[PDB]
């Protein structure tokens, strides 16, 4: 006869478990004892109940494990396995973190950049706001004329990159124009790209004489 004890502590060295949402998480606590100990789980120090999450959870007493399907942010917390028998009790707590994320092209906030105006010699700025998981790359572009035309052989517009994300550039999401001239007038584009795809929105600059 004996109080509970861990049979495989190696699988318990990993303290923090951080996972992307919608994946299945499994926690284990292989144990021994005589008589065979029973197993129960706590979520944040309190009894873990089937109604504590949509769909509840599952367990495999053969594997001393807790299984939570399609996890979401709200599942974040501490999970404790409690192993008991008439002679004693032992426990172990894991921490779970759930982050939602997926490969989607950038999404821009509607309305930005916004149109702008100012007199010759004045200053102005264009702003762009981005939502993107995979690191986004921002280029500020102006539609220009190259060799006598606004559009090339492919019908597409001639573009000049004025600024783009980089350690040699500051404040990627804002394009500030200073001591403007009637030549700066035109269409400015905020093009944001990640490896999945791109997005872009534009605004105009009007120069008053």
């Amino acid at each position: 006869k004996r109080a509970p004890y861990w049979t495989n502590t190696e699988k318990m060295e990993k303290r923090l478990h951080a996972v992307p949402a919608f994946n299945t998480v499994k926690f284990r606590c292989p144990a021994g004892g005589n008589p065979m100990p029973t197993m129960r789980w706590l979520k944040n120090g309190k009894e873990f109940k089937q109604e504590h999450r949509i769909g509840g959870y599952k367990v495999r007493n053969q594997h001393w494990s807790l299984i939570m399907e399609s996890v979401v942010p709200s599942d974040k917390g501490n999970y404790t396995c409690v192993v008991e028998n008439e002679y004693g009790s032992i426990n172990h707590t894991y921490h779970l973190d759930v982050v939602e994320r997926s490969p989607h092209r950038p999404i821009l906030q509607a309305g930005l950049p916004a149109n702008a105006s100012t007199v010759v010699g004045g200053d102005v700025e264009f702003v762009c706001k981005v939502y993107s998981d995979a690191q986004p790359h921002i280029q500020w572009i102006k539609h220009v004329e190259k060799n006598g035309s606004k559009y090339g052989p492919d019908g597409l517009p001639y573009l000049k990159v004025l600024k783009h994300s980089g350690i040699n550039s500051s404040n990627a999401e804002v394009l500030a124009l200073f001591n403007v001239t009637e030549a700066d007038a035109g269409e400015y584009i905020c093009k944001v790209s990640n490896y999945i795809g791109q997005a872009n929105q534009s605004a105009w600059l009007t120069v008053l004489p």
Binding site: A18, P20, V99, S102, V130, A134, Q135, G166
Partner: protein, 135 residues
């Protein structure tokens, strides 16, 4: 809430549960120590799908040398650029751009020690990373 990408982050490795960390002495490892001041990383896309990974504490840039060792360069060079991709289970992976053809990933072993590029393979937990906030 736009602009979350430009906030510092911890790069969590699912292999052992460590946080990627840059040590002043240039060496790089992983620590479950979430208080460690050398794990707050600033990511930026120098080109589409190409990123720099910089310590907000020391200003060093994560990098991989001709062998596959992860060092924290004081100045940004061509060994500091990585290709950030999301994998099938939605974890991030970082492949050395300079050695991209050889599939040399950024990775940590269960024992917290970087798993040299030549030793990293697709189906490994060592390369699976998850960006987490500062808390």
């Amino acid at each position: 809430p736009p602009g979350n990408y430009k906030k510092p982050k911890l790069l969590y490795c699912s292999n052992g549960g460590h946080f990627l960390r840059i040590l002043p002495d240039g060496t790089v490892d992983g620590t479950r120590d979430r208080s460690d001041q050398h794990i707050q990383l600033q990511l930026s896309a120098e080109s589409v799908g190409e990123v720099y990974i910089k310590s907000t504490e020391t200003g060093q840039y994560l990098a991989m040398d001709t062998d596959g060792l992860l060092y924290g360069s004081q100045t940004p060079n061509e060994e500091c650029l990585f290709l950030e991709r999301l994998e099938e289970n939605h974890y991030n992976t970082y492949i050395s751009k300079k050695h991209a053809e050889k599939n040399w990933f950024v990775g940590l072993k269960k024992n917290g020690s970087c798993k040299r590029g030549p030793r990293t393979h697709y189906g490994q937990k060592a390369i699976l990373f998850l960006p987490l906030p500062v808390s």
